[PDB]
Design an enzyme around this catalytic site. Structure first.
Site, PDB file in Angstrom:
ATOM      1  N   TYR A 289      10.151  -8.058 -22.153  1.00  0.00           N
ATOM      2  CA  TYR A 289       8.947  -7.243 -22.291  1.00  0.00           C
ATOM      3  C   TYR A 289       7.676  -8.096 -22.103  1.00  0.00           C
ATOM      4  CZ  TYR A 289       5.221  -4.942 -25.136  1.00  0.00           C
ATOM      5  OH  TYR A 289       4.050  -4.447 -25.651  1.00  0.00           O
ATOM      6  N   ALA A 290       6.763  -7.643 -21.240  1.00  0.00           N
ATOM      7  CA  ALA A 290       5.470  -8.319 -21.022  1.00  0.00           C
ATOM      8  C   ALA A 290       4.345  -7.530 -21.700  1.00  0.00           C
ATOM      9  CB  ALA A 290       5.185  -8.465 -19.554  1.00  0.00           C
TER      10      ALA A 290
ATOM     11  N   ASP B 264       7.439  -9.530  -1.970  1.00  0.00           N
ATOM     12  CA  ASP B 264       6.777  -8.307  -2.466  1.00  0.00           C
ATOM     13  C   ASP B 264       5.820  -8.643  -3.615  1.00  0.00           C
ATOM     14  OD1 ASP B 264       6.167  -5.561  -2.589  1.00  0.00           O
ATOM     15  OD2 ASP B 264       7.858  -5.104  -3.918  1.00  0.00           O
TER      16      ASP B 264
ATOM     17  N   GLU C 181       0.825  -5.079  -9.000  1.00  0.00           N
ATOM     18  CA  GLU C 181       1.687  -4.215  -9.839  1.00  0.00           C
ATOM     19  C   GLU C 181       2.977  -4.907 -10.256  1.00  0.00           C
ATOM     20  OE1 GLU C 181       1.722  -1.831  -6.202  1.00  0.00           O
ATOM     21  OE2 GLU C 181       0.265  -3.488  -6.489  1.00  0.00           O
TER      22      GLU C 181
ATOM     23  N   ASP D 117      10.050  -7.909 -10.445  1.00  0.00           N
ATOM     24  CA  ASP D 117      10.504  -7.002  -9.369  1.00  0.00           C
ATOM     25  C   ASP D 117      11.068  -7.756  -8.156  1.00  0.00           C
ATOM     26  OD1 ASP D 117      11.069  -4.783  -7.807  1.00  0.00           O
ATOM     27  OD2 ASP D 117       9.026  -3.990  -7.717  1.00  0.00           O
TER      28      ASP D 117
HETATM   29  N1  LIG Z   1       9.014  -6.088 -18.383  1.00  0.00           N
HETATM   30  C1  LIG Z   1       7.959  -5.234 -18.328  1.00  0.00           C
HETATM   31  N2  LIG Z   1       7.019  -5.192 -19.305  1.00  0.00           N
HETATM   32  C2  LIG Z   1       5.973  -4.341 -19.231  1.00  0.00           C
HETATM   33  N3  LIG Z   1       5.763  -3.486 -18.215  1.00  0.00           N
HETATM   34  C3  LIG Z   1       6.624  -3.426 -17.161  1.00  0.00           C
HETATM   35  C4  LIG Z   1       7.788  -4.326 -17.170  1.00  0.00           C
HETATM   36  N4  LIG Z   1       8.478  -4.093 -16.032  1.00  0.00           N
HETATM   37  C5  LIG Z   1       7.829  -3.120 -15.365  1.00  0.00           C
HETATM   38  N5  LIG Z   1       6.719  -2.733 -16.020  1.00  0.00           N
HETATM   39  C6  LIG Z   1       5.818  -1.687 -15.505  1.00  0.00           C
HETATM   40  O1  LIG Z   1       6.602  -0.775 -14.729  1.00  0.00           O
HETATM   41  C7  LIG Z   1       6.227  -0.783 -13.337  1.00  0.00           C
HETATM   42  C8  LIG Z   1       7.454  -0.639 -12.414  1.00  0.00           C
HETATM   43  O2  LIG Z   1       8.360  -1.728 -12.590  1.00  0.00           O
HETATM   44  P1  LIG Z   1       9.086  -2.413 -11.302  1.00  0.00           P
HETATM   45  O3  LIG Z   1      10.192  -3.235 -11.907  1.00  0.00           O
HETATM   46  O4  LIG Z   1       7.980  -3.075 -10.520  1.00  0.00           O
HETATM   47  O5  LIG Z   1       9.609  -1.086 -10.564  1.00  0.00           O
HETATM   48  P2  LIG Z   1       9.902  -0.899  -8.979  1.00  0.00           P
HETATM   49  O6  LIG Z   1      11.076  -1.811  -8.724  1.00  0.00           O
HETATM   50  O7  LIG Z   1      10.264   0.560  -8.885  1.00  0.00           O
HETATM   51  O8  LIG Z   1       8.604  -1.254  -8.297  1.00  0.00           O
HETATM   52  C9  LIG Z   1       5.452  -2.087 -13.169  1.00  0.00           C
HETATM   53  O9  LIG Z   1       4.461  -1.976 -12.138  1.00  0.00           O
HETATM   54  C10 LIG Z   1       4.814  -2.289 -14.538  1.00  0.00           C
HETATM   55  O10 LIG Z   1       3.658  -1.447 -14.630  1.00  0.00           O
HETATM   56 MG   LIG Z   2      11.918  -2.589  -6.860  1.00  0.00          MG
HETATM   57 MG   LIG Z   3       7.426  -2.905  -8.487  1.00  0.00          MG
END
Ligand SMILES: Nc1ncnc2c1ncn2[C@@H]1O[C@H](COP(=O)(O)OP(=O)(O)O)[C@@H](O)[C@H]1O
Ligand SMILES: [Mg+2]
Ligand SMILES: [Mg+2]
Ligand SMILES: CCOC(=O)C[C@@H]1C(=O)NCCN1Cc1ccc(C)cc1
Ligand SMILES: [Cl-]
Ligand SMILES: [Cl-]
Ligand SMILES: [Cl-]
Length: 265
Positions: free
Chosen positions: A86-87, A130, A134, A148
């Site tokens: 978690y971030a 990538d 975001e 991601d």
């Molecule tokens: N570990 C995390 N802690 C807090 N927020 C997160 C975390 N992972 C993802 N998010 C939020 O969720 C969004 C989508 O996650 P991501 O893994 O980038 O999905 P995708 O693979 O569909 O792009 C991120 O842009 C961020 O806003």
């Molecule tokens: Mg993805």
């Molecule tokens: Mg993403």
């Protein structure tokens, strides 16, 4: 091993193309984490099982303070769950919307943290491909964390997958579908540095078609407030010919970076 019944689910943290991401707490330990939820039907329709596999493989074996941990995964009849670090301070994307532009110290500090993380990755010939705001998360001390890894691969590489949304962070050789390597992440670093200082990405336009033309011709200009040192670094990273883009060591030792950054290598 893990199953849904092991967790209490909390507020939505964010939504991506496939990822629906929630705060969650493991019941026995009270451990707080992020649960990234994916729908098997969508993964199948778009045929990106191989990306899911890359994400888990790569991100679970990487260990760096500026790279988001993946602890594990499970699945049921309709969904796949990735168990993530978690971030707590959210995305760089969100921070940019809040503040509009970043000052030189903030920017240089983020670029150093990025360069450190990418140096670790590239040493295993892993390329992210990538890198955009975001997908950049913030730790409890405000430290940057790359996330991601679904688009990541080992270099050199072709592209076997259809591009998704915005072209804004991709270099000419990726959009033109040519062979490519580690230097793609250097181009993206240049795009990010510009966007941090200016408030928008250097090749932004109204249409996909115009953005493509701007990238392939490397057509960008600076507002008057961007300083000589920032201009030098950005211009070196945004070279059409990838062999002409600097090494990450040269980024970390750039005088504008060492003059303004709060963190070391
Ligand atoms: N570990 C995390 N802690 C807090 N927020 C997160 C975390 N992972 C993802 N998010 C939020 O969720 C969004 C989508 O996650 P991501 O893994 O980038 O999905 P995708 O693979 O569909 O792009 C991120 O842009 C961020 O806003
Ligand atoms: Mg993805
Ligand atoms: Mg993403
Ligand atoms: C490590 C990659 O895979 C898993 O994360 C979980 C699990 C597994 O262990 N191998 C692959 C099938 N299965 C997941 C799965 C995902 C998507 C669809 C459409 C079907 C099945
Ligand atoms: Cl390939
Ligand atoms: Cl690909
Ligand atoms: Cl290097």
């Amino acid at each position: 091993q893990w199953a849904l019944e092991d967790f209490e689910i909390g507020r939505p943290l964010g939504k991506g193309k496939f990822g629906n991401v929630y705060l969650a707490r493991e019941k026995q330990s009270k451990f707080i984490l992020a649960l990234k939820v994916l729908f098997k039907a969508q993964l199948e329709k778009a045929g990106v099982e191989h990306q899911l596999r890359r994400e888990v493989e790569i991100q679970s074996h990487l260990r760096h303070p500026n790279i988001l941990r993946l602890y594990g995964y499970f699945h049921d009849a309709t969904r796949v769950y990735l168990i993530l670090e978690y971030a707590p301070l959210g995305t760089v994307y969100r921070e940019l919307q809040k503040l509009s532009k970043f000052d030189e110290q903030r920017t240089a500090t983020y670029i150093t943290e990025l360069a450190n993380a990418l140096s670790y990755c590239h040493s295993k010939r892993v390329i992210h491909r990538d890198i955009k705001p975001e997908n950049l998360l913030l730790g409890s001390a405000g430290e940057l964390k790359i996330a991601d890894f679904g688009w990541s691969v080992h270099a050199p590489s072709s592209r076997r997958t259809t591009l998704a949304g915005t072209l804004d962070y991709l270099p000419p050789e990726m959009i033109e579908g040519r062979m490519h390597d580690e230097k793609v992440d250097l181009w993206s670093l240049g795009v990010l540095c510009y966007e941090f200082l200016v408030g928008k990405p250097p090749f932004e336009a109204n249409t996909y078609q115009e953005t493509y033309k701007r990238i392939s011709r490397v057509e960008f200009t600076f507002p008057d407030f961007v300083t000589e040192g920032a201009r030098d670094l950005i211009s070196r990273l945004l070279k059409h010919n990838p062999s002409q883009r600097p090494m990450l060591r040269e980024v970390l030792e750039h005088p504008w970076i060492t003059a303004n950054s709060s963190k070391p290598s």
